């Protein structure tokens, strides 16, 4: 009977541990589902915005080019004024 | 009643196997959570990086329009002087 009492007590300890682990697993499932939703959202948002890397680099090059053209005109004008000084 | 102890012994062993298997499932979920947390921070920064490119793109476009106006104004001054 003492082996029987020992087995019965341990089985009840196992049943409580099964429930405890399950509650912890329930929480982790909710975390995983929320992270999955957030990651899918962020992934879509990044993809829709990806074009701006390309457009930024193209726009910057265009800006640098017209700035160079403008500076050339400014130099021509300054020279023409100084030639007439 | 030795076969009765066997019976209960069998039930306890199954409970311990199911318990261990839940733990193994938890281990996999903790790994999932860690990988997702990393992927989400990475994606959040990458989205933020695209937002910086968007801001800078619009700022470059604004600068380009202003420089174009300035160039037209200089071109006019030159035209007045060369006429």
């Amino acid at each position: 009977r003492a082996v029987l009492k020992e087995l019965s007590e341990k089985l009840e300890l196992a049943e409580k541990a099964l429930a405890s682990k399950q509650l912890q697993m329930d929480e982790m499932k909710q975390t995983i589902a929320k992270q999955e939703e957030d990651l899918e959202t962020m992934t879509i948002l990044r993809a829709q915005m990806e074009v701006y890397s390309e457009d930024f680099h193209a726009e910057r090059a265009a800006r640098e080019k017209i700035h160079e053209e403008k500076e050339q005109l400014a130099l021509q004008l300054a020279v023409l004024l100084k030639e007439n000084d | 009643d030795r076969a009765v102890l066997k019976e209960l012994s069998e039930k306890l062993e199954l409970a311990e196997k199911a318990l261990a298997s839940k733990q193994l499932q938890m281990d996999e979920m903790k790994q999932t959570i860690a990988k997702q947390e990393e992927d989400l921070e990475t994606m959040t920064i990458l989205r933020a990086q695209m937002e910086v490119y968007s801001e800078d793109f619009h700022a470059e476009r604004a600068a380009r329009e202003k420089i174009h106006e300035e160039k037209e104004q200089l071109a006019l001054q030159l035209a007045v002087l060369l006429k």
Binding site: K10, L13, A17 | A15, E16, K17, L19, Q23, D27
Partner: peptide, 29 residues
């Protein structure tokens, strides 16, 4: 059963335990 060693933290647990007393992992995990 008798005492059993936790296969993660190496602590030797009492026969009555089903979870490790240190790390709470089940004996067969």
């Amino acid at each position: 059963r008798g005492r059993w060693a936790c296969q993660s933290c190496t602590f030797e647990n009492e026969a009555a335990a089903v979870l490790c007393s240190i790390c709470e992992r089940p004996r067969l995990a």
